Amino acid sequence: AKLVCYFTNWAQYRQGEARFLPKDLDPSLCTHLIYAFAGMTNHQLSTTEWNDETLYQEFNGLKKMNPKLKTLLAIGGWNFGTQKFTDMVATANNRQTFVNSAIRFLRKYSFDGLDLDWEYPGSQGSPAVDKERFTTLVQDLANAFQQEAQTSGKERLLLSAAVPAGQTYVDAGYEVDKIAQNLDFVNLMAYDFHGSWEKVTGHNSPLYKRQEQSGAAASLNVDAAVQQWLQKGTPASKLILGMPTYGRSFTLASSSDTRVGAPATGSGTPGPFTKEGGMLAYYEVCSWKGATKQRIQDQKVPYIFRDNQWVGFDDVESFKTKVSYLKQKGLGGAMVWALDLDDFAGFSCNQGRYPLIQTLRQELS
Ligand SMILES: C=NC1=N[C@@H]2[C@@H](O)[C@H](O[C@@H]3O[C@H](CO)[C@@H](O[C@@H]4O[C@H](CO)[C@@H](O)[C@@H](O)[C@H]4NC(C)=O)[C@@H](O)[C@H]3NC(C)=O)[C@@H](CO)[C@@H]2O1
């Protein structure tokens, strides 16, 4: 089974014990490590931090300690946008310029593959035409990757993509059945189902829906996301189930109504280390004494509150539940975002180093 874990090249700027660099990485924790994120300049793959080349080397150098490990470079991301993607896949000359740079870039830095993270083709400013242009991009990469392997005589470069769970987005830009044939594995983003962008508290990653949910609202859970990608044609073994080492917070309109579905006046106080209201690292949810942990029985995930602060998150338990759920589904494995937000150095949760992902590795193996 696969355990695809994401490293992020901006965690390095967090303060104190929250700072994360390749040295905080465990070469054996995951089967595949994906480096987030690499951008694009003139239709080509490029760095995004002043020290990506140094990081790239330490990142991939980890394979000297674990030759079984596979590393990939992720291009895109939420904040990346759609512009540069839509423009790069618009002309053959551009697609080919990108592909050739991807290959040369990945090989130069010792990456084993590329993880496409276009959020998302077919929306957010992306013309519905990009739905089929994406598919072409995938085929182009796959084809070039296959050809190169034979000429260079090296392990063929791997091709993956981070994909949305929403029904609306899959229909809008993904030719599921067709891309699945060319993607070595699909990284399903089964989270962000609920967030502070809503007026009511909801869980970031509920495994199942709540009895009181119907219609489109009943699809906002992992299972729906999974059943969906399978039905549309994804071999269960290529579908990797994503899980978050972060949770989503809300500020309660009143601390008297703390249930899931209660009135939220907006995002929760930013985390002292993550400093991005509405989300929190697992290790930030740990430093909470005097809080109250619940359990959304129907969705098999927890959440905690203290005064006007409510946060739905994942713990060692829900992670075990989820690892167990995917097994039953015959999925290819688990995906986690991000190594970065777990208690990677056992400095806050008192459960050791990488409490959550370690749970994943042990449960999966
Ligand atoms: C598995 N792939 C995958 N891709 C999606 C990610 O985009 C997303 O995580 C979010 O990624 C954006 C960047 O695209 C991050 O933006 C960063 O936010 C911090 C504040 O927290 C800010 O200071 C900047 O460093 C900013 N950097 C950039 C390059 O914009 C975060 O918003 C990040 N969010 C979380 C909760 O990690 C994940 C999860 O939705 C998806 O998974």
Short mmCIF file of C-alpha atoms and ligand atoms in Angstrom, two decimals:
data_model
loop_
_atom_site.label_atom_id
_atom_site.label_comp_id
_atom_site.label_asym_id
_atom_site.label_seq_id
_atom_site.Cartn_x
_atom_site.Cartn_y
_atom_site.Cartn_z
CA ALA A 1 0.00 0.00 0.00
CA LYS A 2 1.07 3.58 -0.67
CA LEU A 3 1.56 6.29 1.93
CA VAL A 4 1.99 9.51 -0.08
CA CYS A 5 3.08 12.39 2.14
CA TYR A 6 3.39 16.07 1.20
CA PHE A 7 6.30 18.29 2.20
CA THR A 8 5.79 22.04 1.81
CA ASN A 9 8.63 24.45 1.08
CA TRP A 10 7.18 27.33 3.12
CA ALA A 11 6.97 25.51 6.43
CA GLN A 12 10.61 26.46 6.71
CA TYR A 13 9.54 29.99 7.62
CA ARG A 14 7.40 29.13 10.66
CA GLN A 15 8.66 30.26 14.06
CA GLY A 16 10.40 28.09 16.63
CA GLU A 17 9.61 24.41 16.94
CA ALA A 18 7.14 24.89 14.12
CA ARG A 19 9.91 25.48 11.58
CA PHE A 20 10.21 22.57 9.13
CA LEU A 21 13.10 21.69 6.78
CA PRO A 22 14.13 18.43 5.05
CA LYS A 23 16.16 17.41 8.12
CA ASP A 24 12.86 17.01 9.98
CA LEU A 25 11.87 14.43 7.42
CA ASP A 26 11.89 10.71 8.21
CA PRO A 27 13.12 8.81 5.10
CA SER A 28 11.06 5.71 6.09
CA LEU A 29 7.70 7.12 7.22
CA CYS A 30 6.15 7.21 3.76
CA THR A 31 6.43 5.27 0.49
CA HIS A 32 6.21 8.45 -1.63
CA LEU A 33 7.22 12.03 -0.76
CA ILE A 34 5.80 14.93 -2.76
CA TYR A 35 7.42 18.37 -2.75
CA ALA A 36 4.95 21.27 -2.65
CA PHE A 37 5.19 23.48 -4.52
CA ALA A 38 6.97 24.30 -7.75
CA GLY A 39 5.66 27.07 -10.00
CA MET A 40 5.82 28.01 -13.66
CA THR A 41 7.78 30.62 -15.62
CA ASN A 42 7.41 30.91 -19.38
CA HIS A 43 5.53 27.61 -19.64
CA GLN A 44 8.28 25.84 -17.71
CA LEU A 45 8.69 24.17 -14.34
CA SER A 46 10.53 26.44 -11.89
CA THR A 47 11.39 26.93 -8.22
CA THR A 48 9.46 29.16 -5.77
CA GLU A 49 11.85 29.61 -2.85
CA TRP A 50 15.39 31.00 -2.75
CA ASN A 51 16.65 27.60 -1.67
CA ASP A 52 14.66 25.05 -3.63
CA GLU A 53 17.78 23.57 -5.26
CA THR A 54 19.32 22.95 -1.84
CA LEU A 55 16.08 21.52 -0.53
CA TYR A 56 15.54 19.46 -3.66
CA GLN A 57 18.92 17.84 -3.04
CA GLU A 58 18.35 17.12 0.66
CA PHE A 59 14.82 15.97 -0.15
CA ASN A 60 15.94 13.49 -2.81
CA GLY A 61 19.19 12.71 -1.02
CA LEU A 62 16.93 10.93 1.46
CA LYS A 63 16.81 8.04 -1.03
CA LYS A 64 20.41 7.25 -0.17
CA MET A 65 19.09 6.23 3.24
CA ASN A 66 16.02 4.63 1.73
CA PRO A 67 16.32 3.54 -1.94
CA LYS A 68 12.72 2.32 -1.86
CA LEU A 69 11.38 5.83 -1.38
CA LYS A 70 9.87 7.63 -4.44
CA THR A 71 9.89 11.43 -4.58
CA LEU A 72 7.72 13.66 -6.79
CA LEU A 73 7.45 17.40 -7.44
CA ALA A 74 3.99 18.98 -7.24
CA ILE A 75 3.16 21.89 -9.55
CA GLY A 76 0.33 24.26 -8.77
CA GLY A 77 -1.71 24.43 -5.61
CA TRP A 78 -4.75 26.35 -4.48
CA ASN A 79 -3.05 29.77 -4.44
CA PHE A 80 -1.39 29.10 -7.79
CA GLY A 81 -4.45 29.89 -9.85
CA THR A 82 -5.58 28.65 -13.25
CA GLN A 83 -4.17 31.30 -15.63
CA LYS A 84 -0.70 29.82 -16.27
CA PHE A 85 -2.09 26.30 -16.61
CA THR A 86 -4.78 27.21 -19.16
CA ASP A 87 -2.21 29.21 -21.12
CA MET A 88 0.46 26.48 -21.02
CA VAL A 89 -1.89 23.77 -22.31
CA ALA A 90 -3.35 26.07 -24.97
CA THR A 91 -0.69 25.37 -27.62
CA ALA A 92 1.29 22.27 -28.53
CA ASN A 93 4.46 24.34 -28.53
CA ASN A 94 3.70 25.34 -24.93
CA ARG A 95 2.71 21.89 -23.68
CA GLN A 96 5.86 20.47 -25.28
CA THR A 97 7.96 23.27 -23.78
CA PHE A 98 6.58 22.44 -20.34
CA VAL A 99 6.93 18.66 -20.70
CA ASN A 100 10.55 18.87 -21.83
CA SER A 101 11.33 21.22 -18.94
CA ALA A 102 9.50 18.97 -16.47
CA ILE A 103 11.59 15.97 -17.55
CA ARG A 104 14.89 17.87 -17.58
CA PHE A 105 13.96 19.54 -14.27
CA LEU A 106 12.91 16.32 -12.50
CA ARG A 107 15.99 14.44 -13.71
CA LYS A 108 18.40 17.24 -12.87
CA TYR A 109 17.20 17.34 -9.28
CA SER A 110 16.54 13.60 -8.87
CA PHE A 111 12.76 13.64 -8.64
CA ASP A 112 11.04 10.39 -9.52
CA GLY A 113 7.88 12.02 -10.76
CA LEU A 114 5.49 14.90 -11.11
CA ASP A 115 2.32 15.57 -9.19
CA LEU A 116 -0.12 17.83 -11.05
CA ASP A 117 -2.09 20.15 -8.80
CA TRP A 118 -4.17 22.43 -11.04
CA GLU A 119 -6.95 23.89 -8.94
CA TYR A 120 -8.86 23.40 -10.97
CA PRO A 121 -9.21 22.84 -14.71
CA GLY A 122 -12.79 23.80 -15.58
CA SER A 123 -13.47 26.44 -12.96
CA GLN A 124 -12.02 29.27 -10.89
CA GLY A 125 -11.52 31.11 -14.18
CA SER A 126 -10.88 28.02 -16.24
CA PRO A 127 -13.00 27.63 -19.40
CA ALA A 128 -14.80 24.30 -19.64
CA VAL A 129 -12.51 23.63 -22.60
CA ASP A 130 -9.68 23.07 -20.10
CA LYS A 131 -11.45 19.86 -19.12
CA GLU A 132 -10.16 18.10 -22.22
CA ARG A 133 -6.98 20.14 -22.49
CA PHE A 134 -6.09 18.76 -19.06
CA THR A 135 -6.57 15.22 -20.30
CA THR A 136 -4.27 16.00 -23.22
CA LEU A 137 -1.66 17.43 -20.84
CA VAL A 138 -1.80 14.23 -18.85
CA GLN A 139 -1.41 12.04 -21.93
CA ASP A 140 1.47 14.21 -23.17
CA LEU A 141 3.35 13.88 -19.90
CA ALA A 142 2.67 10.16 -19.66
CA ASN A 143 3.83 9.60 -23.26
CA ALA A 144 6.97 11.70 -22.91
CA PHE A 145 7.69 10.02 -19.59
CA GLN A 146 7.40 6.58 -21.13
CA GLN A 147 9.56 7.49 -24.11
CA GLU A 148 12.25 9.16 -22.02
CA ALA A 149 12.59 6.18 -19.70
CA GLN A 150 13.49 3.98 -22.64
CA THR A 151 16.03 6.42 -24.10
CA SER A 152 17.58 7.42 -20.75
CA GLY A 153 17.37 3.88 -19.41
CA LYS A 154 16.09 5.03 -15.99
CA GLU A 155 12.99 4.26 -13.90
CA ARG A 156 10.09 5.83 -15.79
CA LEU A 157 9.00 9.13 -14.22
CA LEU A 158 5.71 8.80 -12.31
CA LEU A 159 2.64 10.95 -12.97
CA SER A 160 0.07 11.83 -10.31
CA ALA A 161 -2.54 14.53 -9.74
CA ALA A 162 -4.15 16.02 -6.64
CA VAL A 163 -7.90 16.03 -7.26
CA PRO A 164 -11.00 17.69 -5.71
CA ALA A 165 -13.71 15.74 -3.94
CA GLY A 166 -16.65 17.95 -4.95
CA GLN A 167 -19.15 16.60 -7.50
CA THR A 168 -19.30 20.00 -9.15
CA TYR A 169 -15.58 20.18 -9.84
CA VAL A 170 -15.09 16.64 -11.09
CA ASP A 171 -17.90 17.09 -13.62
CA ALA A 172 -16.50 20.48 -14.59
CA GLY A 173 -12.92 19.56 -15.44
CA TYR A 174 -12.02 15.91 -15.05
CA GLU A 175 -12.33 13.16 -17.66
CA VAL A 176 -11.91 10.65 -14.80
CA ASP A 177 -11.92 7.38 -16.76
CA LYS A 178 -9.46 8.83 -19.28
CA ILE A 179 -6.96 10.39 -16.92
CA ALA A 180 -6.99 7.37 -14.61
CA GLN A 181 -5.50 5.34 -17.45
CA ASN A 182 -2.53 7.71 -17.56
CA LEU A 183 -2.07 8.61 -13.91
CA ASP A 184 0.06 6.17 -11.93
CA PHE A 185 -2.00 7.24 -8.92
CA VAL A 186 -4.63 9.76 -7.98
CA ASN A 187 -4.23 11.82 -4.83
CA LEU A 188 -7.80 12.46 -3.63
CA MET A 189 -8.18 15.59 -1.51
CA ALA A 190 -10.82 14.28 0.87
CA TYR A 191 -10.96 17.30 3.16
CA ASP A 192 -12.03 20.97 3.20
CA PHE A 193 -15.58 19.64 2.97
CA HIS A 194 -16.52 22.29 5.53
CA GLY A 195 -14.78 25.53 6.54
CA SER A 196 -15.03 28.99 8.08
CA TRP A 197 -16.21 30.27 4.73
CA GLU A 198 -19.63 29.08 5.92
CA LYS A 199 -21.99 30.45 8.60
CA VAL A 200 -22.17 27.16 10.52
CA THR A 201 -19.60 24.79 12.11
CA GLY A 202 -18.88 21.68 10.05
CA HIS A 203 -16.10 19.11 9.98
CA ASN A 204 -13.10 19.55 7.65
CA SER A 205 -12.91 15.82 6.90
CA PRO A 206 -15.97 13.77 7.96
CA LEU A 207 -15.76 10.13 6.84
CA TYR A 208 -19.55 9.78 6.62
CA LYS A 209 -22.43 12.25 6.45
CA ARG A 210 -24.70 13.28 9.34
CA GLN A 211 -28.17 11.74 9.52
CA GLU A 212 -29.57 15.27 9.17
CA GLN A 213 -27.98 15.85 5.76
CA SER A 214 -29.58 15.45 2.31
CA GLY A 215 -28.90 16.19 -1.34
CA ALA A 216 -25.70 17.98 -2.28
CA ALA A 217 -25.04 18.53 1.43
CA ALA A 218 -24.90 14.77 1.90
CA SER A 219 -21.97 14.44 -0.50
CA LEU A 220 -19.65 16.60 1.64
CA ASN A 221 -17.84 13.64 3.21
CA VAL A 222 -14.97 11.30 2.30
CA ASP A 223 -17.06 8.26 1.36
CA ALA A 224 -19.07 10.29 -1.17
CA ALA A 225 -15.80 11.60 -2.65
CA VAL A 226 -14.39 8.09 -2.84
CA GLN A 227 -17.47 6.32 -4.22
CA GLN A 228 -17.55 9.08 -6.79
CA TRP A 229 -14.04 8.64 -8.16
CA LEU A 230 -14.45 4.89 -8.23
CA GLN A 231 -17.80 4.98 -10.04
CA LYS A 232 -16.47 7.42 -12.64
CA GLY A 233 -13.74 4.92 -13.48
CA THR A 234 -10.80 5.05 -11.10
CA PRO A 235 -9.22 1.67 -10.37
CA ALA A 236 -9.54 1.43 -6.58
CA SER A 237 -5.81 0.64 -6.40
CA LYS A 238 -4.80 3.94 -7.99
CA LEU A 239 -7.07 5.94 -5.71
CA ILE A 240 -5.11 7.18 -2.69
CA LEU A 241 -7.26 8.49 0.19
CA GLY A 242 -6.14 11.91 1.39
CA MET A 243 -6.28 12.90 5.06
CA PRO A 244 -5.41 16.17 6.82
CA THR A 245 -3.01 16.78 9.68
CA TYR A 246 -4.81 20.09 10.00
CA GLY A 247 -8.33 20.97 11.08
CA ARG A 248 -10.70 23.85 10.39
CA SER A 249 -11.85 26.36 12.97
CA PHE A 250 -14.77 28.74 13.45
CA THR A 251 -15.54 31.45 15.98
CA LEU A 252 -18.83 30.61 17.64
CA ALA A 253 -21.59 33.22 17.53
CA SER A 254 -22.14 32.10 21.14
CA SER A 255 -20.24 29.63 23.33
CA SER A 256 -23.61 28.28 24.47
CA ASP A 257 -24.19 26.57 21.13
CA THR A 258 -21.13 24.37 20.54
CA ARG A 259 -22.64 21.54 18.50
CA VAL A 260 -21.67 20.68 14.94
CA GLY A 261 -23.86 22.87 12.78
CA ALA A 262 -23.95 25.72 15.29
CA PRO A 263 -23.81 29.44 14.29
CA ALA A 264 -20.31 30.64 13.44
CA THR A 265 -19.47 34.33 13.06
CA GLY A 266 -16.50 33.39 10.92
CA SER A 267 -13.04 31.79 11.03
CA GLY A 268 -11.44 30.73 14.29
CA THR A 269 -8.54 32.58 15.87
CA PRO A 270 -5.38 32.04 13.77
CA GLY A 271 -2.99 29.43 15.15
CA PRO A 272 0.09 30.92 16.92
CA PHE A 273 2.35 29.07 14.48
CA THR A 274 0.19 28.63 11.37
CA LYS A 275 -1.27 32.11 11.70
CA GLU A 276 -4.03 31.53 9.15
CA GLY A 277 -7.44 31.80 10.78
CA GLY A 278 -9.87 29.09 9.81
CA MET A 279 -7.29 26.33 9.87
CA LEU A 280 -4.94 24.87 12.48
CA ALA A 281 -2.09 22.39 12.57
CA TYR A 282 -2.70 19.17 14.50
CA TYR A 283 0.03 20.29 16.89
CA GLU A 284 -1.90 23.49 17.60
CA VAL A 285 -5.04 21.58 18.49
CA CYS A 286 -2.86 19.64 20.99
CA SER A 287 -1.88 22.67 23.06
CA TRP A 288 -5.48 22.95 24.25
CA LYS A 289 -6.04 22.36 27.95
CA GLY A 290 -9.44 23.42 29.24
CA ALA A 291 -11.10 22.54 25.95
CA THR A 292 -13.74 19.92 25.28
CA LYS A 293 -13.23 17.08 22.81
CA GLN A 294 -16.36 15.54 21.30
CA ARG A 295 -16.92 13.01 18.52
CA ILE A 296 -19.31 13.35 15.61
CA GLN A 297 -20.61 9.78 15.95
CA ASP A 298 -22.07 9.72 12.43
CA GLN A 299 -18.89 11.02 10.81
CA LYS A 300 -16.33 9.18 12.97
CA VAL A 301 -14.12 12.28 13.52
CA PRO A 302 -13.56 14.63 16.49
CA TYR A 303 -13.76 18.35 17.18
CA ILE A 304 -13.04 20.52 20.17
CA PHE A 305 -14.17 23.83 21.60
CA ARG A 306 -13.27 26.36 24.27
CA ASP A 307 -15.33 29.53 24.65
CA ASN A 308 -16.09 30.87 21.17
CA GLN A 309 -13.54 28.62 19.43
CA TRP A 310 -14.65 25.51 17.55
CA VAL A 311 -12.35 23.26 15.49
CA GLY A 312 -13.13 20.11 13.55
CA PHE A 313 -10.00 17.98 13.10
CA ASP A 314 -8.48 14.50 12.72
CA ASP A 315 -6.70 12.48 15.42
CA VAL A 316 -4.97 9.12 15.82
CA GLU A 317 -8.35 7.47 16.14
CA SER A 318 -10.10 8.91 13.07
CA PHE A 319 -6.91 8.20 11.13
CA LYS A 320 -7.17 4.52 12.12
CA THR A 321 -10.85 4.50 11.15
CA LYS A 322 -10.02 6.00 7.77
CA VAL A 323 -7.07 3.69 7.15
CA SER A 324 -9.46 0.86 7.92
CA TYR A 325 -12.18 2.28 5.67
CA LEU A 326 -9.92 2.53 2.62
CA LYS A 327 -8.68 -1.03 3.19
CA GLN A 328 -12.26 -2.31 2.92
CA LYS A 329 -12.57 -0.28 -0.32
CA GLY A 330 -9.41 -1.84 -1.70
CA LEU A 331 -7.82 1.57 -2.24
CA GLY A 332 -4.18 2.03 -3.21
CA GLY A 333 -3.35 3.66 0.10
CA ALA A 334 -3.34 6.91 2.02
CA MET A 335 -2.31 10.46 1.20
CA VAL A 336 -1.54 13.07 3.80
CA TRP A 337 -1.34 16.83 3.78
CA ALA A 338 1.09 17.59 5.18
CA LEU A 339 4.12 16.04 6.98
CA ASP A 340 4.45 19.64 7.91
CA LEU A 341 1.37 20.02 10.19
CA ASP A 342 1.64 16.77 12.14
CA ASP A 343 3.62 16.97 15.39
CA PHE A 344 6.69 16.07 13.29
CA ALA A 345 9.08 16.41 16.25
CA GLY A 346 6.86 15.34 19.15
CA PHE A 347 7.04 18.87 20.61
CA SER A 348 3.43 19.42 21.50
CA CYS A 349 1.14 16.43 21.47
CA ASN A 350 3.11 14.12 23.77
CA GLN A 351 2.55 11.16 21.43
CA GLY A 352 6.01 11.13 19.95
CA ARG A 353 7.26 12.15 16.52
CA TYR A 354 4.70 12.25 13.67
CA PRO A 355 1.85 10.86 15.81
CA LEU A 356 -0.72 10.90 13.00
CA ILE A 357 1.28 9.81 9.95
CA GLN A 358 3.11 7.21 12.08
CA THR A 359 -0.37 5.90 12.79
CA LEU A 360 -0.97 5.75 9.03
CA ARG A 361 2.29 3.92 8.30
CA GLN A 362 1.73 1.34 11.04
CA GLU A 363 -1.93 0.81 10.14
CA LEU A 364 -1.12 0.53 6.43
CA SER A 365 1.82 -1.81 6.88
C1 LIG B 1 -2.57 17.42 -2.04
N1 LIG B 1 -2.51 18.59 -2.66
C2 LIG B 1 -3.17 19.65 -2.18
N2 LIG B 1 -3.13 20.83 -2.76
C3 LIG B 1 -3.97 21.78 -2.04
C4 LIG B 1 -3.12 22.80 -1.28
O1 LIG B 1 -3.08 24.03 -2.01
C5 LIG B 1 -3.85 23.01 0.05
O2 LIG B 1 -3.07 23.58 1.13
C6 LIG B 1 -2.96 25.00 1.05
O3 LIG B 1 -1.98 25.35 0.05
C7 LIG B 1 -1.81 26.80 -0.06
C8 LIG B 1 -0.87 27.12 -1.23
O4 LIG B 1 -1.45 26.62 -2.43
C9 LIG B 1 -1.21 27.32 1.24
O5 LIG B 1 -0.94 28.72 1.10
C10 LIG B 1 -0.04 29.20 2.10
O6 LIG B 1 -0.80 29.58 3.28
C11 LIG B 1 0.04 30.14 4.32
C12 LIG B 1 -0.81 30.43 5.57
O7 LIG B 1 -1.24 29.19 6.15
C13 LIG B 1 0.65 31.44 3.79
O8 LIG B 1 1.44 32.05 4.81
C14 LIG B 1 1.51 31.14 2.55
O9 LIG B 1 2.62 30.33 2.91
C15 LIG B 1 0.70 30.40 1.49
N3 LIG B 1 1.57 29.92 0.41
C16 LIG B 1 1.21 29.94 -0.87
C17 LIG B 1 2.25 29.38 -1.85
O10 LIG B 1 0.13 30.37 -1.28
C18 LIG B 1 -2.18 27.01 2.40
O11 LIG B 1 -3.39 27.76 2.24
C19 LIG B 1 -2.51 25.50 2.44
N4 LIG B 1 -3.59 25.24 3.40
C20 LIG B 1 -3.49 24.28 4.33
C21 LIG B 1 -4.66 24.03 5.28
O12 LIG B 1 -2.48 23.59 4.41
C22 LIG B 1 -4.24 21.57 0.35
C23 LIG B 1 -5.30 21.44 1.44
O13 LIG B 1 -6.50 22.09 1.02
C24 LIG B 1 -4.63 20.88 -0.96
O14 LIG B 1 -3.95 19.59 -1.06
#
